[PDB]
Design a protein around this ligand. Structure first.
Ligand code: BR
Length: 277
């Protein structure tokens, strides 16, 4: 039911990849975890769930964000699920922005996607239960993500305020119902009734929030998707209209890539550490 696929020592801790049979997704799923040195001592550590964006697997962040050095210093485990169900038994699309590598962290209601694309239930319910039963971790968790994953982290935190201590994102899709990436995915996964899309839009959820999770968002000003897909100003508007504890930082010259993420990921870890402990 569970297989450890790889184990790589990293800054005194361990990066480990797993495969398991997911009950929510009804298929084999891969996730990666980074266990800091503290995990080898008997201590329990907090967990930051990291949600990746379009076309990513469970490994991109682990390999490219350079989060391990500070995670090891702070004693924080990081768990990175895949971005969709995977396999020939799972529906796909030829486009980078639909299907595999593109689950959008929603529970699909439309055929043929609904058979396996239950990524919201996976990240919110199944994965944390698995993590906490396998690893020396406490029940303190936070969540973060990039782009499609930034959309994932914000929506999931906003909808589950009592479960997450803090949330952050790089370049999130803030207002998916109003951009092509979100409209294409939601139409496919959720259908044409745009009313059902509302619970999966970070900006709408932030406007509606009754409970707050402290939020940190970083956006690169040289990000080519900023105006058409991401719309940080819409998230700022939502926050201002609902007393929301959001800090949104804009960075000149920085883009959408992991070069941007790596340049600021330490701020995120320190932010999450503040609330995890
Ligand atoms: Br993305």
């Amino acid at each position: 039911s569970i297989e450890n696929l790889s184990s790589n020592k990293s800054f005194g801790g361990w990066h480990k990849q797993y495969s398991h049979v997911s009950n929510t997704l009804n298929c084999a799923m891969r996730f990666a975890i980074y266990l800091p040195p503290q995990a080898s001592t008997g201590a329990k550590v907090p967990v930051l769930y990291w949600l990746s964006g379009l076309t990513c697997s469970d490994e991109n962040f682990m390999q490219k964000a350079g989060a391990q050095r500070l995670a090891a210093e702070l004693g924080i485990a990081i768990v990175a699920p895949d971005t969709s169900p995977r396999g020939e038994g799972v529906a796909d699309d030829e486009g980078y922005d639909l299907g595999q590598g593109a689950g959008f962290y929603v529970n699909a209601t439309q055929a043929p996607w609904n058979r396996h694309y239950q990524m919201y239930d996976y990240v919110v319910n199944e994965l944390p239960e698995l993590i906490e039963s396998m690893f020396p971790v406490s029940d303190k968790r936070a969540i973060a993500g990039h782009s499609m994953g930034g959309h994932g982290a914000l929506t999931i935190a906003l909808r589950n305020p009592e479960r997450y201590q803090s949330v952050s994102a790089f370049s999130p899709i803030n207002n998916p119902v109003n951009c092509p990436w979100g409209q294409k995915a939601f139409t496919a996964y959720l259908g044409k009734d745009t009313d059902t899309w509302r619970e999966y839009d970070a900006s709408l959820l932030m406007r509606a929030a009754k409970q707050y999770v402290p939020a940190l968002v970083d956006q690169g000003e040289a990000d080519n998707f900023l105006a058409e897909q991401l719309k940080p100003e819409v998230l700022e508007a939502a926050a201002s209209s609902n007393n929301y504890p959001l800090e949104l930082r804009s960075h000149e010259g920085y883009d959408h890539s992991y070069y941007f993420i790596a340049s600021f990921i330490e701020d995120h870890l320190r932010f999450h550490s503040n609330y995890l402990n």
